[PDB]
Write a protein that binds this DNA or RNA. Sequence first.
RNA 1: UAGCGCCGGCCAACUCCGUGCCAGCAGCCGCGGUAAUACGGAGGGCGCGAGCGUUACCCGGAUUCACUGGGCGUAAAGGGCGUGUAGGCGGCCUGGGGCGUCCCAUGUGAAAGACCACGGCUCAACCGUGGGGGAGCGUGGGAUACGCUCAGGCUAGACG
RNA 2: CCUGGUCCACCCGUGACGCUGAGGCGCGAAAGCGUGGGGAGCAAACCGGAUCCGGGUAGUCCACGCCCUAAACGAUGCGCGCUAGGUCUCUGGGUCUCCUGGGGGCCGAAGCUAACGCGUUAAGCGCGCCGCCUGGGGAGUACGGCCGCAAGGC
RNA 3: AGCUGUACCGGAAGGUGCGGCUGG
Lengths: 138, 220, 150
Amino acid sequence: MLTDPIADMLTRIRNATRVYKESTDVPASRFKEEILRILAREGFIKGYERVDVDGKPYLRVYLKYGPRRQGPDPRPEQVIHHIRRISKPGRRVYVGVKEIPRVRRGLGIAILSTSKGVLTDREARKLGVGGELICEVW
Amino acid sequence: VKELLEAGVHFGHERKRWNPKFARYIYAERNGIHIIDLQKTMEELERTFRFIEDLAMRGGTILFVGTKKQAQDIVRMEAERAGMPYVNQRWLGGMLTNFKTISQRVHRLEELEALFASPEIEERPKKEQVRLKHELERLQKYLSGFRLLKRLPDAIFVVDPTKEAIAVREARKLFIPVIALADTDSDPDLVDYIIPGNDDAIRSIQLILSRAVDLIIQAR
Amino acid sequence: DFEEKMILIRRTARMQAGGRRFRFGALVVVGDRQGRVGLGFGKAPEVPLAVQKAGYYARRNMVEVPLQNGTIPHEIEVEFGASKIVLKPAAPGTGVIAGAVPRAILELAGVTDILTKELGSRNPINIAYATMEALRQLRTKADVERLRKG
RNA sequence: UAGCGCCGGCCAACUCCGUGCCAGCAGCCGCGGUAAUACGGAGGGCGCGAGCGUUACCCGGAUUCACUGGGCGUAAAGGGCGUGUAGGCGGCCUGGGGCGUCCCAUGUGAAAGACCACGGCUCAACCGUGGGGGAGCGUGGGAUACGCUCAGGCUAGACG
RNA sequence: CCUGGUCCACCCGUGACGCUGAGGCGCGAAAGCGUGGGGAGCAAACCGGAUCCGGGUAGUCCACGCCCUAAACGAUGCGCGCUAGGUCUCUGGGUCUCCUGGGGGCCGAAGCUAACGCGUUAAGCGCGCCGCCUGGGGAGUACGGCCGCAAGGC
RNA sequence: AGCUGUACCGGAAGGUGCGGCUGG
């Protein structure tokens, strides 16, 4: 069965990017909505919209790619080069304010589910709180 | 539209052959055949034609690549009615990545052509003359039209991107923009400026190439 | 304008009709110490021919490194076959910390301060290719901003 | 007062004479049967220096027990299969609790050792003064995003 | 005759009742053993010939108990989600030349692999749980323990 | 053809019976 919905979304997005689809569909959840909102704010994806697939609520994610390239293999550069799940069921990862990771010298972002909702590494450090390290994106 | 419809441009190949990557250009399916969306064809044609017009105005060089059985004569006639070179017999592997080597053959053909029109041919007895005749005939058949290229071209025009995949690869490797008259069984991603049309149906190729060459001539 | 040094010379053999035929392979890195590097592999019957061919090849397979304060913008790990390379930025006044192959590649690129590591198979050819691939996959702040925001 | 090791590759530093699978060297590869920069001596040269080498033990290189940071078609590695106990993990929509989790304040975390600053032995080792940092735990007060639990609803898993 | 699993259509009911599984329990080709029957053909060991052929006991068969191994292999643990297609074939359903499920193969996008190759039946991208590896030989050997009448197995 | 579990060799640089696999 489906054990980790968040990992499911991460893999879905990765698989969508790797084949250059304009949009993808995912089962609906509030926490997933929050994650996608964070991603959209940081300009990783073109944006999300709540839709309905044959009765069931879904979210359609519109993806963003780079410009068409030259030479052999003209496939554009990805905007999401690498997305990884940190805290998984069976081994949860919790970090304090002092242990918040820096991803790619600030070129990347990390998602923290803290007491004050879902934040990036920057804003989590700003508000001076720690939480659960959901995933890293760069 | 109204000029493309009668030429059978919008008639593709069967369901058996269609390349998935081309699906974005399919209008609908009827009678076990695929249909290309006329509208999309129209704006793609507009874009590519604008590019070709600009390149012609700047004084660029375009190479014509059509080898398919029915397209040989069309390519020949359409190319001759312009300064642009062409390849219409068979794409020798390495006309671009190995341009120098083929230029050696161009030089050889030039030297032979000069020799046969010289009053020094009274040497080299009849049999050697016949051998040289055979050599000259072969080089003329294969290397005609290509002789115009003093250097690397500025763009490439291909009738079928799949049949002439080697030429596409070479052009991609040497940063040469590609113009293709693709169909249902082609890869859109490998062509910078694509015309979704037909590769069979002499009428379609005639129309497209005639329009292209007229645009070339007009912009000079 | 471009200065040259050798990664490695090797001699390979092939059987024939009662005998051995030897061909020489050269791995050559070229650079300008300004943020541009090239790598080539040349195979020839003779050593000078191999060196010439390798340099000739390297002169086109060209890479621009986005240098800043003579160090890499960000850390990167790259897998090529069974080889792994790890590169990390360093503060000014650290020095090139690398093996023969990575040091040779990075010095010609103008890199002055970096921490490197080799993992898995340590075959020179694959390490060199991995290093080049890692160099090709480097971005700066400006590039990321342009792609994201636009 | 100037000694000790090494000079084939790893690894910095080459030439003569003696012996001819003998005497020997050897950390690995290996060197020695007429050329041997690899044995012994000499000349010369590298490295360190009142020290220089050898042996024994620990960590590293070893991502070679892989939490960071490995794997199991053919290199070592999927149990001969099923049912299932303990255990491990687990759909979405609102609430209550605040155990895990995060934050703030405070107590402790002795002295010496580690770090930083200054200072006393002619300098340094050595020592002194001062300032912090510190994993963890106790007490008091906050938050509910995620895990947990207690209530209610749903049909996309499962079952009929 | 009795009985297990499974698939499709209707979308009618329950409202998370699910996945995996150390031990345990059961099944487990062939060969082999015990208590009884049976024995046409074939055939270990064995009896003869020229140095493969002719015979021939156990065994192969049945009932009830043991034994528990293997190139027990797809040399690929189980469950769920995502990621282009083409072709052949088995079996269902529809508005029937096509559309939609569930199996068995072949070519191949992206991707993975050291390579061979795999590729919606993944050896790809992931999550959950169990089993196993730490250079070759010695060696699946020695001692100990458990199982079995024994060979032997773990 | 090779390999393999098992069961036997008083004409054993291996042989045969019952299977199984292609790593022919």
